From a paper:
We found the C-terminal 20 amino-acids in 14-3-3 ω to be disordered and thus crystallized a truncated 14-3-3 ω1−237 in complex with pBKI1265−272 and pBZR1169−175, yielding better crystals diffracting to 2.35 and 1.90 Å resolution, respectively. In contrast, the entire pBZR1169−175 (RISNpSAP) is well defined in the ligand binding site of 14-3-3 ω, with the N-terminal Arg169–Ile170 peptide adopting a different conformation in the 14-3-3λ—pBZR1169−175 complex. We next made use of the high number of molecules in the asymmetric units of our 14-3-3 ω crystal form to study the structural plasticity of pBKI1265−272 and pBZR1169−175 binding. In contrast, pBZR1169−175 is not only found well-ordered in our 14-3-3 ω complex structure, but also binds in a highly similar conformation to all 14-3-3 ω molecules in the asymmetric unit, in good agreement with the high binding affinity observed by ITC and GCI. We found that the phosphorylated pBZR1169−175, but not the un-phosphorylated BZR1169−175 peptide bound the surface-adsorbed 14-3-3 ω dimer with a dissociation constant of ∼0.5 µM, very similar to the value obtain by ITC. Binding in GCI is characterized by a relatively fast dissociation rate, with an estimated 14-3-3—phosphopeptide complex lifetime of ∼1s. We found Arg136 and Tyr137 to form hydrogen bond networks with pS270 in pBKI1 and with pS173 in [name], respectively. Asn233 forms hydrogen bonds with the backbone of both peptides.
Author numbering:
A (entry chain B): -1 to 236
B (entry chain A): 4 to 237
C (entry chain K), D (entry chain L): 1169 to 1175
Amino acid sequence: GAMASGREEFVYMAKLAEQAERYEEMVEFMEKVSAAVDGDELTVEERNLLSVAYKNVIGARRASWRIISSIEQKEESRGNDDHVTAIREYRSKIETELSGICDGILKLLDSRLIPAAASGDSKVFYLKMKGDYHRYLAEFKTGQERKDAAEHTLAAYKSAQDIANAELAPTHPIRLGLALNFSVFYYEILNSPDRACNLAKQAFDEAIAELDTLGEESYKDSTLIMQLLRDNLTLWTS
Amino acid sequence: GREEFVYMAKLAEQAERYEEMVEFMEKVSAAVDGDELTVEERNLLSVAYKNVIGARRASWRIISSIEQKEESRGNDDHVTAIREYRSKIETELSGICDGILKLLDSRLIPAAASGDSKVFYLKMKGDYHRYLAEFKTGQERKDAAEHTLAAYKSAQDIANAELAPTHPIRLGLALNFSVFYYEILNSPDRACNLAKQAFDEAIAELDTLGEESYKDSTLIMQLLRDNLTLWTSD
Amino acid sequence: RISNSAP
Amino acid sequence: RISNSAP
Ligand code: NA
Ligand code: NA
Ligand code: NA
């Protein structure tokens, strides 16, 4: 409907796109929600839908980028310059998509979502999200653009961590999710496995110490993130 | 040209970017004037369209179930929104079927020079008319079903006469022909009878098969049985 | 969906 | 990759 308007209608459309697994349209619908709320704050349901939408869109291209990059390296070592040329053009097309996807959500975060975040929960959530999409940029950018991306990732994760340490319980899924992704940043982007393990073990330990504060409500999301922390630590150790 | 776009199509498959895989293989087919696609090129073409249509088919079924539920709830506002969305998916469904059906009618079917490829492209013509019949209504649905039956019948005639009963293309045709009867024409007895005959004729000479050829046939035959096991119990 | 078609 | 990030 050309006269569709407001968060409620476009929230519903985003839920349809999600069931249909048409995540590009789910992004489009959630961007219209953001436009309708501009100034105010997204609800928890809306922010999570926005996040699901961009997570699935970018995740498809991240997966494609990885397989195409591995094929490029294989063809390079085979000496097949003509294939390599073709693979590079194709990887470049996927990179322009990755870049445009990250730019979309980063523009919403910088211009609307972060400026309006009121509670400590919301500030950490969106600052973590900003660092997440700068990190996806650092996964494939090169040269100066990669350094700029990694710097923007650190800056967003560190500012989120300062707020989380002060305002969120160690068992809070947002605080834990930030610690997990910050440690992945250390390991995968900065190639610092020791700093990654230290941060992942710290967050895990702090959560374990207070594992009676997470009650039946967040308890389930927290344990899953704690299991991911544990699993990364095992892999990074072995 | 031909080989460049075949390679690009293989990259798109790895990347699971199937809309781009269709574009690349449409360019391969255009580069091959009169000649038949190779088996490799033929299978890349089918995987590409199969995955592109397969995803809209999945989306359509989910959205259709949602439409019925919101109607049962009296949420007419939601129903309207869902119908507009289902209509958008049907447009894509219609446009995807149109692309492969035009290609089949103008290039692939005329160029087919052996029973092998004749059955393959006729079966594929029936397949995509059948995907039209899954969601079309009124005269468009009637037209789709009429073209599916005619494509599949022509395919079956060539296949019975020139392809071993164990040939995965002949078995696939029987499989899809039987599904057509069960799902589109609501003829379960005929669906079962067709699937059963095709199965029996395949187990009859299932001894001649080797090793690479055995896995190919046995896979289709197990799908034939799985349908029969369910159809025969209703 | 109950039925399966050819791969 | 080796590492899991958050849901
Ligand atoms: Na809302
Ligand atoms: Na945007
Ligand atoms: Na906000």
